[PDB]
């Protein structure tokens, strides 16, 4: 139904599906379904439901073996959600989590883009103790030399 342009109908159809109920369902499959629900809700811009689904998914799965793609997609969707919301500090934290992934770390352009986003969003964040802490942490990074303008 999404491929036919019925994004709202597809999101509504996928929303009623409660992944947590199906215990026998594989954890990676469950998280993939959760991320699909996230994507559909963001496509239909139901940000409250997206936040609820974000509360549904746990943050300890992304530190596993083959969860790199799931981690990247989930953090991209969370970045989109907080981009609509405007919480720049949460966006910076999500981008930092993206940058710490080994897959992005390996590829040059991907980690460079992740660091660019991290520094730009920590710049966008309002001044506070946590923002200053994050600025100190990000500034004390050696890879910033690969992005001279961003380091300056």
């Amino acid at each position: 139904k999404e491929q036919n342009g019925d994004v709202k109908e597809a999101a509504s159809i996928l929303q009623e599906l409660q992944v947590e109920t199906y215990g026998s369902m594989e954890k990676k499959e469950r998280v993939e379904f959760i991320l699909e629900q996230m994507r559909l809700c963001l496509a239909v811009k139901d940000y409250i439901r997206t936040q609820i689904i974000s509360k549904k998914i746990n943050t300890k799965f992304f530190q596993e073996e083959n969860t790199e793609k799931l981690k990247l997609k989930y953090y991209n969707l969370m970045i989109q959600l907080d981009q609509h919301e405007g919480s720049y500090l949460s966006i910076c934290k999500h981008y930092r989590a993206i940058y710490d992934t080994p897959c992005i770390q390996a590829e040059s352009e991907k980690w460079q883009q992740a660091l660019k986003s991290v520094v730009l969003y920590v710049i966008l964040a309002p001044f506070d103790n946590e923002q200053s802490d994050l600025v100190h942490r990000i500034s004390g990074d050696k890879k910033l030399e690969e992005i001279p303008k961003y380091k300056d």
Binding site: T21, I52, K55
Partner: peptide, 20 residues
């Protein structure tokens, strides 16, 4: 088991939905 989950997991996992 499903009843126990539907009754208890929300106060444990997602107490914030009650505030919602």
């Amino acid at each position: 088991i499903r009843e126990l989950r539907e009754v208890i997991e929300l106060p444990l996992t997602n107490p914030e939905l009650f505030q919602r």
